[PDB]
Amino acid sequence: MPEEIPDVRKSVVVAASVEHCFEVFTSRPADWWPPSHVLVKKERAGLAFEPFVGGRYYEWDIDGTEIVWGRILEWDPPHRLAMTWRIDGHWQSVPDDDRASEIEVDFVPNGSGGTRVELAHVKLHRHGDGAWNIHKALDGPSPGETLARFANVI
Numbered sequence: 001m002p003e004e005i006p007d008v009r010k011s012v013v014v015a016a017s018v019e020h021c022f023e024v025f026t027s028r029p030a031d032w033w034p035p036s037h038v039l040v041k042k043e044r045a046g047l048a049f050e051p052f053v054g055g056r057y058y059e060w061d062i063d064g065t066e067i068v069w070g071r072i073l074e075w076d077p078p079h080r081l082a083m084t085w086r087i088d089g090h091w092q093s094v095p096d097d098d099r100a101s102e103i104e105v106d107f108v109p110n111g112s113g114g115t116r117v118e119l120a121h122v123k124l125h126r127h128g129d130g131a132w133n134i135h136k137a138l139d140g141p142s143p144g145e146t147l148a149r150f151a152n153v154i
Contacts, residue, residue: 001136002143005125011118012147014154018078018115021107024154026051032153035140039133040091044069051075057086068093073102081105081117089130091137099127119147
């Protein structure tokens, strides 16, 4: 749905405190996880994950049980955020990371309550397990880097 799997992505500035950036992910991503149409049979509504290295990430579906939505890489206090995403191309589950890719995200205060973050993705295709289909569902209106949809809803 989005431009073909692009290598390093770009950065965007959004109006939000740095604490909000890390807090919003752990606060309740369901607040803006659903854009309009989702390939998932049921729209995600509840979310709960342990933020740590090798942590486990799962979400609750309106009628579906818990499915892994990704994983974690490392939590760095207000300044650097990194997370590994482990998911199946068929939106099923991946008990082990065989070809999972890592994501690098940095959050730093920009000007006033505005925070600027640089998000880059590399070797995401290494998954070659159909993970691209998962991105299509996450890709909502106005396709673009994750910061694009995140900044608009934020």
